[PDB]
Symmetry: C3
Subunit: 182 residues, 3 copies
């Protein structure tokens, strides 16, 4: 045992290794593995590096969700919106939503459309300038997308609550992407 | 001792476990934990997997910093700006900064307001189109935020160095988010 | 036997080999073990799967040389910085500005974006950006479109606008765009 308490050449085998929960590195060395009792559950440490906290901080999910948008078009348009969430950071990448407009209206989803874990929580809405199209025209003013904390998505023709206009040629948007922390 | 040097059914307990810094996996096995002396400080290894390097390649931090902005308002507005940094990639998510304007001015921070590790270094400034408001109006032209390498943040009413304008209604911006590499 | 129950030993070893097992041998949140439900096995601390968390995120970063041309007398060549995390891409562009000797959009050749950064889910992805033309700072946004064939196009405005012959500089200050492929 005494030989294990100081440096040796032993390649130790064990079915498992249980590290006492302690508030500080017991040896002070950068190559000592220890278990940090300042957290519950405890954190695995390697020297001063907190492995458990680093692992928790690099959480990532990605995929898509179905989104139904409606307003100016004769019928709702349904497409899958791609997403990535890393820690608290979200990206949404939208495919095209475009069709002829039979009425004048903003584009919006139902309340709750954004998956719960992608909804803004620090802010009531988050706003982004995006390129939109109306009746086949490419307007020079930016459109505006607002993501709401209740999960509703609203897309305006311009920053001043602008509506898309009845007409043919395509109203809506080419693919775009927005990134934000919840 | 000899029983520890080959496979056993021991659930070993230790107050800590110090791994000799060595240049190669001493057993070659994918279930061997070791400490890699090819780096200083050393790297935690599991088999051929470099845990320290993998965590360092992500290098994620997140949180917020207090930001004081001033210009058109009677007094500075102070709010926390949320951030994520992943390797060289930064996200900033701003809460609302808006109040009545008693003078005509751009909005800016002090020099050094952006935390040092979020400041552009590859570029002298990085620019983003954002939706801004002035006197309660929602102008169709985008506002512009410029992040400067000296840590100053400037927000303009439009792309042409535009100033926010004296008046009641609210001047500044709804929440927005911008993403960039330093 | 003293090692098989709690002790105050700071143990040293040249390495530590953990038996591959399908479940935590002690049940405790401070036990390190090797999880045989995966190949290669996963390093565990309690119920925390260290190997899985690291394998779930894949980050690359660097830069690529980009040649843009159109309104300028000759192409401009600069490095564009990128990060890719799983399917998520950031591009951060340095300034591309010079005087314009013709009226034209700015574009790259086909295939200019590295293959692993090209949109595949969409044919193009569009972004509003601040551009400059003949030294003027126009209030209308410019537009960058990233195409699935790897071409990059930058327009003076959203309506296929071209940069304009003249002095003062045409192109853009640095900007950044982020998107999933």
């Amino acid at each position: 045992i005494s030989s294990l308490l100081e440096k040796n050449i032993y390649n130790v085998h064990n079915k498992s290794n249980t590290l006492t929960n302690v508030p500080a590195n017991p040896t002070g060395n950068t190559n000592t593995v220890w278990s940090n009792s300042n957290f519950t559950p405890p954190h695995l440490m390697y020297g001063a590096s907190d492995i458990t906290q680093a692992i928790g901080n690099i959480s990532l999910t990605t995929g898509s969700f179905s989104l139904s948008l409606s307003g100016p078009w004769a019928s709702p348009l349904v497409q899958n919106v791609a997403y990535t969430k890393i820690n608290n950071l979200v990206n949404l990448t939208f495919p095209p939503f475009q069709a002829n407009a039979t009425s004048s209206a903003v584009i919006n989803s139902a309340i709750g459309a954004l998956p719960a874990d992608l909804r803004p929580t620090t802010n009531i809405q988050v706003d982004f300038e995006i390129f939109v199209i109306d009746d086949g025209n490419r307007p020079v003013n930016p459109g505006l997308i607002t993501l709401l904390s209740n999960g509703q998505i609203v897309v305006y023709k311009d920053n001043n609550l602008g509506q898309f206009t009845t007409g043919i040629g395509g109203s809506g948007f080419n693919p775009f992407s927005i990134t934000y922390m919840v």
